[PDB]
Design an enzyme around this catalytic site. Structure first.
Site, PDB file in Angstrom:
ATOM      1  N   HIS A  24     -39.711  39.150  23.937  1.00 53.33           N
ATOM      2  CA  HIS A  24     -40.928  38.368  24.159  1.00 53.33           C
ATOM      3  C   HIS A  24     -41.264  38.248  25.661  1.00 53.33           C
ATOM      4  O   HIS A  24     -40.458  37.704  26.427  1.00 53.33           O
ATOM      5  CB  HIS A  24     -40.717  36.951  23.710  1.00 53.33           C
ATOM      6  CG  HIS A  24     -41.853  36.070  24.060  1.00 53.33           C
ATOM      7  ND1 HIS A  24     -42.747  35.641  23.118  1.00 53.33           N
ATOM      8  CD2 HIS A  24     -42.286  35.571  25.244  1.00 53.33           C
ATOM      9  CE1 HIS A  24     -43.679  34.898  23.680  1.00 53.33           C
ATOM     10  NE2 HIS A  24     -43.439  34.865  24.978  1.00 53.33           N
ATOM     11  N   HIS A  62     -38.637  41.700  18.762  1.00 46.10           N
ATOM     12  CA  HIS A  62     -39.548  41.703  19.879  1.00 46.10           C
ATOM     13  C   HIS A  62     -38.896  41.101  21.111  1.00 46.10           C
ATOM     14  O   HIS A  62     -38.115  40.156  21.005  1.00 46.10           O
ATOM     15  CB  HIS A  62     -40.807  40.952  19.446  1.00 46.10           C
ATOM     16  CG  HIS A  62     -41.753  40.666  20.557  1.00 46.10           C
ATOM     17  ND1 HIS A  62     -42.296  41.657  21.349  1.00 46.10           N
ATOM     18  CD2 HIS A  62     -42.320  39.494  20.965  1.00 46.10           C
ATOM     19  CE1 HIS A  62     -43.148  41.106  22.206  1.00 46.10           C
ATOM     20  NE2 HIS A  62     -43.172  39.794  21.998  1.00 46.10           N
ATOM     21  N   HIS A  84     -39.589  39.895  14.627  1.00 50.45           N
ATOM     22  CA  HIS A  84     -41.025  39.865  14.531  1.00 50.45           C
ATOM     23  C   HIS A  84     -41.514  40.418  13.231  1.00 50.45           C
ATOM     24  O   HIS A  84     -42.553  41.084  13.173  1.00 50.45           O
ATOM     25  CB  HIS A  84     -41.663  40.523  15.771  1.00 50.45           C
ATOM     26  CG  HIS A  84     -42.984  39.933  16.128  1.00 50.45           C
ATOM     27  ND1 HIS A  84     -43.974  39.729  15.192  1.00 50.45           N
ATOM     28  CD2 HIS A  84     -43.491  39.509  17.314  1.00 50.45           C
ATOM     29  CE1 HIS A  84     -45.019  39.179  15.786  1.00 50.45           C
ATOM     30  NE2 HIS A  84     -44.743  39.024  17.060  1.00 50.45           N
ATOM     31  N   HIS A  96     -50.291  33.559  22.246  1.00 42.98           N
ATOM     32  CA  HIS A  96     -49.494  34.473  23.018  1.00 42.98           C
ATOM     33  C   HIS A  96     -50.079  35.885  22.844  1.00 42.98           C
ATOM     34  O   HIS A  96     -50.465  36.271  21.714  1.00 42.98           O
ATOM     35  CB  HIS A  96     -48.018  34.400  22.586  1.00 42.98           C
ATOM     36  CG  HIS A  96     -47.150  35.572  23.069  1.00 42.98           C
ATOM     37  ND1 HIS A  96     -46.809  35.797  24.396  1.00 42.98           N
ATOM     38  CD2 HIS A  96     -46.502  36.526  22.362  1.00 42.98           C
ATOM     39  CE1 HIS A  96     -46.034  36.868  24.483  1.00 42.98           C
ATOM     40  NE2 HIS A  96     -45.796  37.301  23.251  1.00 42.98           N
ATOM     41  N   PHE A 100     -53.116  33.888  11.732  1.00 42.45           N
ATOM     42  CA  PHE A 100     -53.768  33.529  13.033  1.00 42.45           C
ATOM     43  C   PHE A 100     -53.476  34.590  14.137  1.00 42.45           C
ATOM     44  O   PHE A 100     -52.737  34.328  15.121  1.00 42.45           O
ATOM     45  CB  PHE A 100     -53.291  32.135  13.463  1.00 42.45           C
ATOM     46  CG  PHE A 100     -54.355  31.258  14.144  1.00 42.45           C
ATOM     47  CD1 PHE A 100     -55.704  31.641  14.234  1.00 42.45           C
ATOM     48  CD2 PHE A 100     -53.984  30.000  14.673  1.00 42.45           C
ATOM     49  CE1 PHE A 100     -56.645  30.766  14.857  1.00 42.45           C
ATOM     50  CE2 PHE A 100     -54.919  29.153  15.276  1.00 42.45           C
ATOM     51  CZ  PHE A 100     -56.231  29.528  15.370  1.00 42.45           C
ATOM     52  N   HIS A 148     -36.742  37.873  19.488  1.00 47.58           N
ATOM     53  CA  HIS A 148     -36.708  37.239  18.207  1.00 47.58           C
ATOM     54  C   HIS A 148     -37.231  38.228  17.172  1.00 47.58           C
ATOM     55  O   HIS A 148     -37.980  39.164  17.500  1.00 47.58           O
ATOM     56  CB  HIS A 148     -37.556  35.970  18.212  1.00 47.58           C
ATOM     57  CG  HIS A 148     -38.953  36.151  18.725  1.00 47.58           C
ATOM     58  ND1 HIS A 148     -39.991  36.597  17.935  1.00 47.58           N
ATOM     59  CD2 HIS A 148     -39.507  35.774  19.899  1.00 47.58           C
ATOM     60  CE1 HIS A 148     -41.116  36.541  18.627  1.00 47.58           C
ATOM     61  NE2 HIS A 148     -40.841  36.062  19.829  1.00 47.58           N
ATOM     62  N   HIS A 197     -48.156  29.807  11.350  1.00 42.82           N
ATOM     63  CA  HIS A 197     -49.611  30.089  11.483  1.00 42.82           C
ATOM     64  C   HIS A 197     -49.869  31.563  11.585  1.00 42.82           C
ATOM     65  O   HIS A 197     -50.884  32.079  11.077  1.00 42.82           O
ATOM     66  CB  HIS A 197     -50.210  29.365  12.685  1.00 42.82           C
ATOM     67  CG  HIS A 197     -50.126  27.864  12.585  1.00 42.82           C
ATOM     68  ND1 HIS A 197     -50.413  27.024  13.643  1.00 42.82           N
ATOM     69  CD2 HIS A 197     -49.780  27.066  11.551  1.00 42.82           C
ATOM     70  CE1 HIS A 197     -50.284  25.759  13.246  1.00 42.82           C
ATOM     71  NE2 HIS A 197     -49.889  25.759  11.975  1.00 42.82           N
ATOM     72  N   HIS A 231     -52.309  24.805  19.384  1.00 45.18           N
ATOM     73  CA  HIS A 231     -51.812  26.166  19.092  1.00 45.18           C
ATOM     74  C   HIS A 231     -51.439  26.881  20.403  1.00 45.18           C
ATOM     75  O   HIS A 231     -52.269  26.985  21.296  1.00 45.18           O
ATOM     76  CB  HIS A 231     -52.889  26.985  18.388  1.00 45.18           C
ATOM     77  CG  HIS A 231     -53.394  26.356  17.149  1.00 45.18           C
ATOM     78  ND1 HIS A 231     -52.711  26.436  15.952  1.00 45.18           N
ATOM     79  CD2 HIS A 231     -54.510  25.604  16.908  1.00 45.18           C
ATOM     80  CE1 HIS A 231     -53.379  25.764  15.019  1.00 45.18           C
ATOM     81  NE2 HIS A 231     -54.469  25.246  15.566  1.00 45.18           N
ATOM     82  N   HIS A 279     -49.129  39.941  23.719  1.00 41.20           N
ATOM     83  CA  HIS A 279     -48.168  40.996  24.047  1.00 41.20           C
ATOM     84  C   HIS A 279     -48.654  41.923  25.165  1.00 41.20           C
ATOM     85  O   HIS A 279     -49.852  42.004  25.477  1.00 41.20           O
ATOM     86  CB  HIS A 279     -47.968  41.818  22.797  1.00 41.20           C
ATOM     87  CG  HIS A 279     -47.170  41.134  21.716  1.00 41.20           C
ATOM     88  ND1 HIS A 279     -46.154  41.777  21.048  1.00 41.20           N
ATOM     89  CD2 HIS A 279     -47.305  39.926  21.115  1.00 41.20           C
ATOM     90  CE1 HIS A 279     -45.668  40.981  20.107  1.00 41.20           C
ATOM     91  NE2 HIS A 279     -46.331  39.838  20.146  1.00 41.20           N
ATOM     92  N   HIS A 289     -51.708  36.248  19.177  1.00 33.65           N
ATOM     93  CA  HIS A 289     -51.602  35.330  18.077  1.00 33.65           C
ATOM     94  C   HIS A 289     -51.047  33.999  18.496  1.00 33.65           C
ATOM     95  O   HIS A 289     -50.452  33.859  19.593  1.00 33.65           O
ATOM     96  CB  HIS A 289     -50.667  35.902  16.982  1.00 33.65           C
ATOM     97  CG  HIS A 289     -49.282  36.160  17.454  1.00 33.65           C
ATOM     98  ND1 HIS A 289     -48.293  35.211  17.387  1.00 33.65           N
ATOM     99  CD2 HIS A 289     -48.701  37.281  17.969  1.00 33.65           C
ATOM    100  CE1 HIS A 289     -47.159  35.728  17.846  1.00 33.65           C
ATOM    101  NE2 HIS A 289     -47.387  36.981  18.219  1.00 33.65           N
ATOM    102  N   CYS A 290     -51.197  33.036  17.583  1.00 31.60           N
ATOM    103  CA  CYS A 290     -50.628  31.734  17.765  1.00 31.60           C
ATOM    104  C   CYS A 290     -49.135  31.920  17.563  1.00 31.60           C
ATOM    105  O   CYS A 290     -48.667  32.615  16.593  1.00 31.60           O
ATOM    106  CB  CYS A 290     -51.158  30.777  16.712  1.00 31.60           C
ATOM    107  SG  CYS A 290     -50.328  29.132  16.843  1.00 31.60           S
ATOM    108  N   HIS A 291     -48.357  31.331  18.464  1.00 35.36           N
ATOM    109  CA  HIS A 291     -46.912  31.527  18.292  1.00 35.36           C
ATOM    110  C   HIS A 291     -46.238  30.447  17.385  1.00 35.36           C
ATOM    111  O   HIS A 291     -45.019  30.458  17.251  1.00 35.36           O
ATOM    112  CB  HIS A 291     -46.201  31.628  19.662  1.00 35.36           C
ATOM    113  CG  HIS A 291     -45.034  32.572  19.673  1.00 35.36           C
ATOM    114  ND1 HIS A 291     -43.893  32.357  18.931  1.00 35.36           N
ATOM    115  CD2 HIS A 291     -44.797  33.686  20.411  1.00 35.36           C
ATOM    116  CE1 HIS A 291     -43.022  33.332  19.157  1.00 35.36           C
ATOM    117  NE2 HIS A 291     -43.538  34.140  20.066  1.00 35.36           N
ATOM    118  N   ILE A 292     -47.025  29.614  16.699  1.00 38.18           N
ATOM    119  CA  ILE A 292     -46.452  28.848  15.593  1.00 38.18           C
ATOM    120  C   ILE A 292     -46.345  29.851  14.455  1.00 38.18           C
ATOM    121  O   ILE A 292     -47.385  30.368  13.891  1.00 38.18           O
ATOM    122  CB  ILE A 292     -47.227  27.588  15.188  1.00 38.18           C
ATOM    123  CG1 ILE A 292     -47.268  26.508  16.333  1.00 38.18           C
ATOM    124  CG2 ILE A 292     -46.621  27.036  13.864  1.00 38.18           C
ATOM    125  CD1 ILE A 292     -48.379  25.404  16.203  1.00 38.18           C
TER     126      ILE A 292
HETATM  127 CU   LIG Z   1     -42.382  35.585  21.105  1.00 37.23          CU
HETATM  128 CU   LIG Z   2     -51.103  27.687  15.510  1.00 32.90          CU
HETATM  129 CU   LIG Z   3     -44.545  38.592  22.811  1.00 31.12          CU
HETATM  130 CU   LIG Z   4     -46.005  38.397  18.726  1.00 27.77          CU
END
Ligand SMILES: [Cu+2]
Ligand SMILES: [Cu+2]
Ligand SMILES: [Cu+2]
Ligand SMILES: [Cu+2]
Ligand SMILES: *[C@@H]1O[C@H](CO)[C@@H](O[C@@H]2O[C@H](CO)[C@@H](O)[C@H](O)[C@H]2NC(C)=O)[C@H](O)[C@H]1NC(C)=O
Length: 495
Positions: A67, A65, A112, A400, A463, A110, A458, A397, A402, A452-455
């Site tokens: 980002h 991805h 995905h 993020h 998430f 990164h 998670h 959290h 897209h 989604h949460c980017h942790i």
């Molecule tokens: Cu990302």
């Molecule tokens: Cu999270």
């Molecule tokens: Cu992204």
């Molecule tokens: Cu993503």
């Protein structure tokens, strides 16, 4: 090292020892972090990804991805596995061919797929602006002013349990740092400056989880860019940067020639800087080649506060100046229990057929898209407001979205909304219990867009949801190359 905008990018396994502990990794372009992918705004990127992975322990299938890149017209090139593509299998390649109209700034790329970017497939992505309105604010802006902050684990991502509080074993700055426990004196990264020059430092969180309190002893930082959006100058002495966020900041090298600590304290893992954990070195030309002996301010007196940021342009804020002041306003119920996260009662589990291909194969509404309850359709050319009230198990959290950036109408730890001039960004902390962090954007980009949460741990624990933006116009807006169409039968046949 910088590559692109047209480039091969091979995905290989290697053992690396960035904190002195050798372990397997998944690398882009052979290095950790991966090479910087770079170009100028409006340039056609053609990134030919060769999957050469053999180590199952980290998955031999990949998907990448870009980002923060909006991917308009190229949703099939966005990268989240089972949202926009099936993974590339080992032995095969795939050409991510896209444009970046309208965008300049500091991004990253990164894996995905599942938690594979933790295992090392992460690198910076910079879109240069030949007419950058901030250019006169510095003298130096190049590969040497990029600073990445990475969490690094001695457990393979596929064996992390999961979840399961997970914590890192070392903070790496530009690919080097010391282990939190039984710290060995392995080499630290160095950032070199010359008395009197000003630097555009591009600070990229490539984190899988922790947020960092970043500072540089004796120095100030003036923020000029947030997640790719130019900002009015904001001088701070500390920046808390959450997973996946980016800032550009001007570093004026205005202290006496010498060695200064660069600090990045993660919110979990090793606390403090003993033995030089959570550290790199800012070294002036002329200084002795020795570790810094500097100390942080006892109290940081100008720490970044998201509400002090303002766009440089006149972005404003779509819709109307009150909550619900939008065409499709939503308020997502974010939960955790029994080791899974949920959005509106549903934990995300990737579907067998990618969301995008469900749409291209004739699915018409969210009701018809799998996974059921994990897709919200959005109408075209409408102002969307999304409220993301915090409280869900830890926390804080960074959400993020897209295909877009968004006005941060309400930030963390501040119940006052801002409908005049909030910063726009793409990843935002939703803060703590009682907060009501709220974002707005306009739907001018047909396709399925992950939220989604980017942790990453998670995200693997569910998430996330997919905003299926303008289903009716998605096929026509996103013609796919046959290589894309070849992705899923290869994947399902190999599996
Ligand atoms: Cu990302
Ligand atoms: Cu999270
Ligand atoms: Cu992204
Ligand atoms: Cu993503
Ligand atoms: C909480 O958030 C609000 C919204 O951005 C901040 O309010 C702004 O405050 C500045 C003064 O610092 C004023 O010039 C603006 O008029 C305010 N904007 C709005 C829309 O009210 C407020 O500063 C934040 N609180 C803290 C403690 O930072």
């Amino acid at each position: 090292v910088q590559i692109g905008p047209v480039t091969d990018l091979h995905i290989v396994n290697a053992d690396i020892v960035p904190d002195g502990f050798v372990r397997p990794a998944v690398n882009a372009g052979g290095t950790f972090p991966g090479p910087v992918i770079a170009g100028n705004v409006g340039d056609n990127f053609q990134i030919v990804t060769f999957n050469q992975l053999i180590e199952c322990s980290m998955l031999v299938d990949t998907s990448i991805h870009w980002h923060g890149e909006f991917q308009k017209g190229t949703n099939w090139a966005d990268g989240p596995a089972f949202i926009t593509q099936c993974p590339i299998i080992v032995g095969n390649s795939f050409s991510y061919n896209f444009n970046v109209p309208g965008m300049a700034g500091t991004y990253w790329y990164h894996s995905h797929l599942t938690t594979q970017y933790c295992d090392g497939l992460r690198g910076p992505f910079v879109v240069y602006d030949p007419n950058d309105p901030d250019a006169n604010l510095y003298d130096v802006d190049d590969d040497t002013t990029i600073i990445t902050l990475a969490d690094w684990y001695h457990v393979l991502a596929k064996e992390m349990g999961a979840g399961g509080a997970i914590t890192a074993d070392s903070t790496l700055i530009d690919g080097l740092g010391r282990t939190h426990v039984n710290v060995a004196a392995v080499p630290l990264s160095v950032i070199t400056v010359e008395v009197g020059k000003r630097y555009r430092m591009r600070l990229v969180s490539i984190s899988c989880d922790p947020n960092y309190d970043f500072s540089i002893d004796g120095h100030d930082m003036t923020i000029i860019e947030t997640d790719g959006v130019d900002s009015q100058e904001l001088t701070v002495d500390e920046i808390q940067i959450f997973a996946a966020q980016r800032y550009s900041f001007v570093l004026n090298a205005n202290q006496p020639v010498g060695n200064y600590w660069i600090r990045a304290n993660p919110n979990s893992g090793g606390e403090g800087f003993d033995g030089g954990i959570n550290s790199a070195i800012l070294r002036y030309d002329g200084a002795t080649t020795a570790d810094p002996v500097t100390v942080a301010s006892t109290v940081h007196t100008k720490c970044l506060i998201e509400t002090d940021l303002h766009p440089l342009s006149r972005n404003g804020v779509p819709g109307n100046p009150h909550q619900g002041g939008a065409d499709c306003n939503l308020n997502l119920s974010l939960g955790f229990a029994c080791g899974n996260f949920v959005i509106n009662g549903v934990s995300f589990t990737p579907p067998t057929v990618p969301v995008l291909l469900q749409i291209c194969s004739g699915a018409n509404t969210a009701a018809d898209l799998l996974p059921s309850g994990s897709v919200i359709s959005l109408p075209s050319n409408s102002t969307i407001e999304i409220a993301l009230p915090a409280g869900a198990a830890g926390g804080p959290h960074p959400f993020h979205l897209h295909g877009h950036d968004f006005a941060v109408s309400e930030s963390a730890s501040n119940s006052t909304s801002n409908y005049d001039d909030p910063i726009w960004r793409d990843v935002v902390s939703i803060g703590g219990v009682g907060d009501n962090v709220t974002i707005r954007f306009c739907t001018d980009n047909p396709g399925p867009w992950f939220l989604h949460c980017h942790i990453d741990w998670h995200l693997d624990a569910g998430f996330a949801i997919v905003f299926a933006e303008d289903i009716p116009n998605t096929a026509s807006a996103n013609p796919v190359p046959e290589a894309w169409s070849n992705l899923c039968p290869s994947y399902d046949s190999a599996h």
